[PDB]
């Protein structure tokens, strides 16, 4: 069976925006979701219908682009590096479970090259927004 979805709430996890992490949703994941591979990783991977083989004990934290925009539009985020390495752990994911040079893996990689690139742009200082203690 599939397992359920990542979390995005945590009674006890703090809520927090930055304008780092407004970037992340608005510049960022707005732009590879609209690339031509988003698709593969706009919503959690169906092993069972992909035929994937203990996808779930190989890859212990599953990640997708539809989770980060869910925890980004709740404050799931501590800071922007926090979603950084959810971007990192998809990337990474697809990596350590597939062939070097196959298909989703040269998706994966397009989107990562657009993702460094447009992390570029992030804003060097952070400005808090909001916090919302659990
Ligand atoms: O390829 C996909 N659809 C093929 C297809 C069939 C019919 C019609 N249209 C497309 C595919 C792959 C992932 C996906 C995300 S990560 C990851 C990974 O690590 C390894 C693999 N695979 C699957 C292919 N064999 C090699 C290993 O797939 C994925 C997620 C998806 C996909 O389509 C449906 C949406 O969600």
Same mark, same amino acid.
């Given at each position: !069976?599939?397992?359920? %979805?990542? &979390?995005? !709430?945590?009674?006890?996890? #703090?809520?927090?925006?930055? *304008? ?8 960022? +994941? ?9 698709? #593969?990783? @706009? ?6 219908? +992909? ?20 925890? +980004? &539009? *709740? ?12 971007? *990192? ?10 062939? %070097? ?12 090259? +657009?993702?460094? @690139? ?7 200082? &952070? ?5 919302? @203690?659990?």
């Amino acid at each position: !069976s599939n397992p359920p %979805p990542p &979390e995005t !709430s945590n009674p006890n996890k #703090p809520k927090r925006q930055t *304008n780092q992490l407004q970037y992340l949703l608005r510049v960022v +994941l707005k732009t590879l979701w609209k690339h031509q591979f988003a698709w #593969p990783f @706009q919503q959690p991977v169906d092993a069972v219908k +992909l035929n994937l083989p203990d996808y779930y004990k190989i890859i212990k934290t599953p990640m997708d682009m539809g989770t980060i925009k869910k925890r +980004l &539009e *709740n404050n799931y985020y501590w800071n922007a590096q926090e979603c950084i390495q959810d971007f *990192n752990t998809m990337f990474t994911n697809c990596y350590i479970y597939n062939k %070097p040079g196959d298909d989703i893996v040269l998706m994966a990689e397009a989107l990562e090259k +657009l993702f460094l @690139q447009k992390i570029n742009e992030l804003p060097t200082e &952070e400005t808090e927004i909001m916090i919302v @203690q659990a």
